[PDB]
Design an enzyme around this catalytic site. Sequence first.
Site, PDB file in Angstrom:
ATOM      1  N   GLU A 216      63.358  23.787 -24.684  1.00 16.30           N
ATOM      2  CA  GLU A 216      63.063  24.063 -23.269  1.00 16.30           C
ATOM      3  C   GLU A 216      64.191  23.482 -22.434  1.00 16.30           C
ATOM      4  O   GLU A 216      64.593  22.311 -22.656  1.00 16.30           O
ATOM      5  CB  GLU A 216      61.773  23.410 -22.802  1.00 16.30           C
ATOM      6  CG  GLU A 216      61.498  23.665 -21.319  1.00 16.30           C
ATOM      7  CD  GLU A 216      60.212  22.992 -20.796  1.00 16.30           C
ATOM      8  OE1 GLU A 216      59.174  23.175 -21.357  1.00 16.30           O
ATOM      9  OE2 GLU A 216      60.289  22.339 -19.750  1.00 16.30           O
ATOM     10  N   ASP A 244      62.114  28.315 -24.161  1.00 19.94           N
ATOM     11  CA  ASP A 244      61.475  28.125 -22.866  1.00 19.94           C
ATOM     12  C   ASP A 244      62.534  27.971 -21.774  1.00 19.94           C
ATOM     13  O   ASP A 244      63.335  27.026 -21.782  1.00 19.94           O
ATOM     14  CB  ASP A 244      60.573  26.895 -22.809  1.00 19.94           C
ATOM     15  CG  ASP A 244      59.159  27.077 -23.439  1.00 19.94           C
ATOM     16  OD1 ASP A 244      58.793  28.100 -24.082  1.00 19.94           O
ATOM     17  OD2 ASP A 244      58.431  26.052 -23.391  1.00 19.94           O
ATOM     18  N   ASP A 256      59.688  21.607 -14.403  1.00 20.16           N
ATOM     19  CA  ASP A 256      59.271  23.009 -14.714  1.00 20.16           C
ATOM     20  C   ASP A 256      59.487  23.900 -13.503  1.00 20.16           C
ATOM     21  O   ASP A 256      58.661  24.710 -13.143  1.00 20.16           O
ATOM     22  CB  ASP A 256      57.841  23.093 -15.183  1.00 20.16           C
ATOM     23  CG  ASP A 256      57.634  22.505 -16.607  1.00 20.16           C
ATOM     24  OD1 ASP A 256      58.587  22.236 -17.350  1.00 20.16           O
ATOM     25  OD2 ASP A 256      56.418  22.372 -16.987  1.00 20.16           O
TER      26      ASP A 256
HETATM   27  O1  GLC Z   1      53.811  24.507 -26.345  1.00 18.98           O
HETATM   28  C1  GLC Z   1      53.438  25.208 -25.216  1.00 18.98           C
HETATM   29  C2  GLC Z   1      53.547  24.400 -23.949  1.00 18.98           C
HETATM   30  O2  GLC Z   1      52.511  23.386 -23.987  1.00 18.98           O
HETATM   31  C3  GLC Z   1      52.446  22.637 -22.768  1.00 18.98           C
HETATM   32  O3  GLC Z   1      51.987  23.508 -21.735  1.00 18.98           O
HETATM   33  C4  GLC Z   1      53.771  21.946 -22.422  1.00 18.98           C
HETATM   34  O4  GLC Z   1      53.697  21.108 -21.197  1.00 18.98           O
HETATM   35  C5  GLC Z   1      54.929  22.951 -22.472  1.00 18.98           C
HETATM   36  O5  GLC Z   1      56.276  22.485 -22.355  1.00 18.98           O
HETATM   37  C6  GLC Z   1      54.933  23.783 -23.772  1.00 18.98           C
HETATM   38  O6  GLC Z   1      56.057  24.694 -23.707  1.00 18.98           O
HETATM   39 MN    MN Z   2      57.688  24.163 -22.625  1.00 16.68          MN
HETATM   40 MN    MN Z   3      58.599  21.204 -19.315  1.00 16.53          MN
END
Ligand code: GLC
Ligand code: MN
Ligand code: MN
Lengths: 387, 387, 387, 387
Positions: A216, A244, A256
């Site tokens: 991410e 991500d 985010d």
């Molecule tokens: O794994 C799926 C997601 O889970 C949660 O929502 C996390 O905060 C996020 O970063 C991740 O991408």
């Molecule tokens: Mn994420």
């Molecule tokens: Mn994040």
Amino acid sequence: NYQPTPEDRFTFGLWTVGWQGRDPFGDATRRALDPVESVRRLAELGAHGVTFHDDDLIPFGSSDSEREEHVKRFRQALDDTGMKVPMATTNLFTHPVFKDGGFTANDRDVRRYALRKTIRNIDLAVELGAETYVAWGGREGAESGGAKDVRDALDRMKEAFDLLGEYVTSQGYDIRFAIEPKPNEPRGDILLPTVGHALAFIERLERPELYGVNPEVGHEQMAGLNFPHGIAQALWAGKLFHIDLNGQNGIKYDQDLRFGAGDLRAAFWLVDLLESAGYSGPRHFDFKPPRTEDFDGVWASAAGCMRNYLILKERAAAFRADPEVQEALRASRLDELARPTAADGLQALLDDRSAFEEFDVDAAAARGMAFERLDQLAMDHLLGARG
Amino acid sequence: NYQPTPEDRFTFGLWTVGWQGRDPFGDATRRALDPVESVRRLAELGAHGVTFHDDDLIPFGSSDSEREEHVKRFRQALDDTGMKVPMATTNLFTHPVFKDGGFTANDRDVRRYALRKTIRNIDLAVELGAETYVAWGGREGAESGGAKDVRDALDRMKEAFDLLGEYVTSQGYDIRFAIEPKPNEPRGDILLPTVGHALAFIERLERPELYGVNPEVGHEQMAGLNFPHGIAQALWAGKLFHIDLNGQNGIKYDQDLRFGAGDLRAAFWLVDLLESAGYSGPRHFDFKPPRTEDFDGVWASAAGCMRNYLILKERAAAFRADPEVQEALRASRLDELARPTAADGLQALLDDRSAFEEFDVDAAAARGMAFERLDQLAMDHLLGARG
Amino acid sequence: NYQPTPEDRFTFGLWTVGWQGRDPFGDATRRALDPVESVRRLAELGAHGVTFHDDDLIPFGSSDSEREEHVKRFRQALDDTGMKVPMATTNLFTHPVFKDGGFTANDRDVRRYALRKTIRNIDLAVELGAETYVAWGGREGAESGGAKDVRDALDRMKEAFDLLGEYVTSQGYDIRFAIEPKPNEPRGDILLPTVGHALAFIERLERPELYGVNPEVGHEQMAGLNFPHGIAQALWAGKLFHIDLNGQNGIKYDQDLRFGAGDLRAAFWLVDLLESAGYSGPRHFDFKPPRTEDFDGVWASAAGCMRNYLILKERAAAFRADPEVQEALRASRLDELARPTAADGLQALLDDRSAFEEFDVDAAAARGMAFERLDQLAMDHLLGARG
Amino acid sequence: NYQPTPEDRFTFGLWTVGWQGRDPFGDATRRALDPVESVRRLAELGAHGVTFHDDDLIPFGSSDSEREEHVKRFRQALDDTGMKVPMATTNLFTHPVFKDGGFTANDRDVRRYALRKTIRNIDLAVELGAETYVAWGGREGAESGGAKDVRDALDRMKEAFDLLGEYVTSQGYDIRFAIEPKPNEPRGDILLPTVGHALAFIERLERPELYGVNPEVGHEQMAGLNFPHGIAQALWAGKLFHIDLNGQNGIKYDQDLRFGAGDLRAAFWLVDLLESAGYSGPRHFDFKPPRTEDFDGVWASAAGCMRNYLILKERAAAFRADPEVQEALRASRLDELARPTAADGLQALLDDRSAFEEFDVDAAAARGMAFERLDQLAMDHLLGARG
Ligand SMILES: OC[C@H]1O[C@H](O)[C@H](O)[C@@H](O)[C@@H]1O
Ligand SMILES: [Mn+2]
Ligand SMILES: [Mn+2]
Ligand SMILES: OC[C@H]1O[C@H](O)[C@H](O)[C@@H](O)[C@@H]1O
Ligand SMILES: OC[C@H]1O[C@H](O)[C@H](O)[C@@H](O)[C@@H]1O
Ligand SMILES: OC[C@H]1O[C@H](O)[C@H](O)[C@@H](O)[C@@H]1O
Ligand SMILES: [Mn+2]
Ligand SMILES: [Mn+2]
Ligand SMILES: [Mn+2]
Ligand SMILES: [Mn+2]
Ligand SMILES: [Mn+2]
Ligand SMILES: [Mn+2]
């Protein structure tokens, strides 16, 4: 005008646009969304698909009939829109039972429960067509040194991922796993904190070919790391199974932001790399419309994710296609970096006097890299300021 | 009173105590040391050994006879003192020819030169008894996105390490390699920026068993990572070949404070782990006596490195031996973390109703981890405040 | 095509383009520049002026006749080019005597020396036409807690600045002082580490009206702070006497990238603010062409500083002039933020039931801020992607 | 054995021990506490007092009779225990109406509401005996550049604090205000992000003598700043009205660890400074027992706050009383740092040839500061390892 269509492969988590705006210091500022409404609004903006945690799609604690109805309605919205579900994941973080982790909880019973909860959702994910199953070990780690023996914890992590690989193999499923790193938050330090740590861990699993990473943007930036460098290492290893996309302003809490916000130049270099390397997975956004926003602002934020990707893709493509940039890249010896250092072999290198005894180190030293000129061509491309 | 002796295996780089105090904003504040004097002063403080870059021991540009005399005098000081040389490394960063890197320079000729310069020093290292040969790619990376294609760069890095492994195998040498990560400085971003990235890279080399890591306390901290966690992952992988011990106050330039300075609690948990795991390599200090100091301050700083390790080792040992801490560790289920999650196997886990259908998630959730009490026992041990 | 001219007020330190590329891990990669050549090359690129430390213009240790000749030649180049010298400063960091500081050195004699060295250069600065005299306390601080009593140090800092204000007042000079914050590097922690700390300190000086700040983009970013916010606070206080423009990628060593590099969006918002507020001082660049570069790369880097400022200025102006952005700004209530909260006065506020007893908090809460839409208009402007 | 009593002046927020363990990624892990039970448990541990936000003591939305009963019961517990209430504050962050701020919300009506909500609680605070009223502008700031004109925002902040000063003056109250900085979280960047920014702002208020700071250990550390340095600057300005004590591991989300956790050496130097300077305010803990913990762990965590302060106070006192440290402090010229640089005055300094023309800069330069030896004496004191 940078209008996305489903062929661009843009995907969103249900939890992204669905975020109600509860943060550690404040209550929700938006109502809960029905996943059906999210699918529909996203489709209308030109998205390709959605992703989910088990507990986003089916409320924790649902009865079998409740569960069946939730999935029915979701399926109908997918069918109504042509939206796909390329990825799914487990919520192993929200419920208080996961306070010390799922797969690496100190309590063995919790660890077994985490596995069962994951396996249940793997079956659903396959049913909905997902090709990737993400694990995000957000509760795996510690706030204090005595609380978590990390070698024992990694033994437990390996055991959990090995069991999941056994399970998918046993069912003949084609789905693969992707580990999503994050260095901290909500645990003081999280295990497998970066792309590198996750890559390294994968190579110790029984069937490493089943596991890649889901890096991410914001998470690697939370450690001050260069996200395009991490992605390049992941691509080098053949392990960029999913991504991500979002924004982050430096080393702080996980913001985010919408993709393109945060570190804009890093977003340009990321898109350049993804496109140059031919990444073919989902262009997935894991973002939170800020809690300042109402529902209209939610959709504007989501639209902006896709817009920014498309603008950056255009600018990067123009950069690499510009003959003047191609000449600069030669001037900076990027062509030479791509050539083998010693395809002649070790003995020839050892016997090559031009590599040492007669190497003119001063003349080499004096040769400028011309990287600033190169970089201003890149700036000028990004900004649409080519003269 | 925490007096080191050579059996404690404490080692120092020539460049540590030898640092003249030139920083980016100021001139040297101390004269250059003769390596012979450093060996002698270190021996007198209870050190086991020293380490060197080629160019610390033999001035860059030396003639063959100059080189032979430098090594002769060094050898004599080793013999005079009983000091060892457990590790050596190459300077692939100081000379301007390395401005864009050694092994991953864009200029192929520079890359060949880097390899030749390394191989020459491998031979010397073996002659002086070194068991580990460190690589620190401090010039490998970029300040701008266009300057360094990272996948091509990693191809070149792999090629270089593969050639070095070929070389040592060809000579029948027992010496092994250790890659020392650093996330930035002097390049804007450095390749293989953390322990995780280096571990992952190693698994792609032709002979991975020849390569481990040389993690440095301050470098992982420069990315805000938990150094004891990184060390644990390295130990888990079987790749802790060597370590650099020092201090660092957070995310900033590389400070290289004396060991025990910086993050004191992280130093306690590090020593606890190294001792618990039975790390048996050198306890090597890579530190800079601050430029405020004169030569007396140099030696005081170096003495303090070893003192702090010995105090922390005593406190950690007392911690883990205290029956009250052993009971707290049980109360926090550290014993359970060390047990397999599902030694019964996958099918038994799937058929175990106590893992899911009948798992009382609320009763599990309600069970406190007791980590704060555990952590204050650890605090009380560290501070010598047991009541 | 964004061509600078001297009317844009772009200035450069002699030490910027003159940086030889010595860093803590490597030797110079470029020869020293004659200040005369720098003035000439900068003038040719469209610069307005240069700035200097005493020791950049006159080598430390110069004789009176040497000094007179250095200034003569410099003056001639200024006259030949039409370049100005709007700012000067003292080198109180390079010489080893400043190892523990200048104005806040523990050694009183060093502190007196620092003052004398500064005062000498104030006279030269006035002679060359400077309007601002910068202080950068880079050696003021500590690596350890016992080394520097900070209250005593601030007493000494105040004393030094008070003496300098006395001096300039005594000579009838119009020159004003600007304190340049930096949070760390080369000291482990530097005193007055941010714009806020410097502003606050100024208010305790005898003649506060004589002192402002010289904030640097990268320095506030080295603490993870928002540079445009800091500049706004400085403008609010009436204390933005001068600025250092450059780029920085997050919390790390002081990179001094060319302006526009680093955090590109922060550079856009900075230019927007400077232009909106009518800052009329020098647009001064404190940057280091990377050591990868040769002299041609030096000048390209410097040109890029000015280009990026001009592109950003155009995009920001277009942003604020766009009727669609003006309507968005209203939709987000930026107009309301500029209105007094309670120009009616305290008693009227207390008696206003619509402020409390009858305030509909839910209806207010439900009103979206529309900040995402606003921000994507800003993105679209910055990138030249308006549809 | 470091047992606190009420004379140590240790205080806790109701929201500290009362934190239910809801974080951005997970639900509460503990039940809500009655404030009465917290007062009682804290008293039993040796606390002096508690602090509150309006909405901690009286649930948002309470009727007048509800409010009166909540305060009655609280008052009874204070009376039952001998606990005090030295500080109170407003919740201007939780309710969604504060999503863009309280005092600097773009919506003027919200700003008026924030003021009314604050003023109501000022009256209660005075009734309960508070001497300090804290403001923490956690919602004041922005995630994007266009959303918040910071100069207009500071105009609104000043207006709000000025009105509050008018109000307290109008009632003849003795209560003073303390602004609590935090650099980010929950807003992307928060206004008045550090101790310095808050100090500087205060000097622009109508009645600056009514306002000080409430610095928090973890918040300044979230910007990588040296907390004891910030406290020293605050003490220098005469503005340390209150403090928040806790722990933080570097630049990341706001962890609010128990005091002594996090940066242990910074906690030692903080206690040294507070005690040396004679700070006489509350020793207030703003911490979160980790969500891993049950109620027993809550109280253990709170006990550890006070224990760690008392251990550090003992070690710091021993440090400064040790004749060997007193001699080291002289050797490092801390005595000289406390002497005026030029009590002889400006003209005498200008006429003093020993300050310049005859200053032997090399002999000064060569004099080591002896700071490492000093610092290891401090280490040895902290760890109880004096030989
Ligand atoms: O794994 C799926 C997601 O889970 C949660 O929502 C996390 O905060 C996020 O970063 C991740 O991408
Ligand atoms: Mn994420
Ligand atoms: Mn994040
Ligand atoms: O590789 C040996 C050493 O080389 C350099 O001196 C580095 O700055 C240091 O961190 C490293 O440990
Ligand atoms: O004060 C003038 C300049 O002095 C030094 O060169 C600093 O590194 C720089 O940031 C500062 O702007
Ligand atoms: O102002 C009182 C308190 O309000 C909030 O609880 C903040 O998170 C905290 O840091 C602050 O000290
Ligand atoms: Mn280092
Ligand atoms: Mn090192
Ligand atoms: Mn700088
Ligand atoms: Mn500067
Ligand atoms: Mn906090
Ligand atoms: Mn606080």
